Amino acid sequence: KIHVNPPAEVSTSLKVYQGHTLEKTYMGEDFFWAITPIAGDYILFKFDKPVNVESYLFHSGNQEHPGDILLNTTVEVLPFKSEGLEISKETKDKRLEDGYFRIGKFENGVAEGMVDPSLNPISAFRLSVIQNSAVWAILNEIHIKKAT
């Protein structure tokens, strides 16, 4: 699908297969196709400006290769403000050492979810590969939706 995502510098540690780069998927042009993701691989969307994020949608696999999905991969967000924000005990528990919050993860090839209003606006979205994959990973759709 084609969405207008917030302007961003987009990068990955992953090796892509035959031109299937992350920037084209972010732009709606083609699907991302990574060779066998390993623990500690990431996909990074670093926004040019802070974004008030309502929700996110990542769909892995596609019609032609439906088992080429993202497994054991988390959804992490970097708040623009590092301090000056009360957050709940539950939300503090999701804070990583590098200051990203772990808000979600891939379940049967899909990650979709709301952003806690207390974390907005956001400077970056990251997808962290926590464990090794046997399968290649397609990203067919990326939608980061603005709340404002």
From Swiss-Prot:
Expressed in pancreas, spleen, thymus, prostate, small intestine, peripheral blood leukocytes and lymph node. Strongly overexpressed in choriocarcinoma cancer cell lines. Down-regulated in pancreatic cancer. Glycans are attached at residue 72. N-glycosylated. The modification Phosphoserine is found at residue 88. Disulfide bonds: none annotated. Glycosyltransferase that catalyze the transfer of GlcNAc from UDP-GlcNAc to the GlcNAcbeta1-2Manalpha1-3 arm of the core structure of N-linked glycans through a beta1-4 linkage and participates in the production of tri- and tetra-antennary N-linked sugar chains. Involved in glucose transport by mediating SLC2A2/GLUT2 glycosylation, thereby controlling cell-surface expression of SLC2A2 in pancreatic beta cells. Belongs to the glycosyltransferase 54 family. This is Alpha-1,3-mannosyl-glycoprotein 4-beta-N-acetylglucosaminyltransferase A. The gene is MGAT4A. The chain holds residues 387 to 534 of 535 of the full protein.
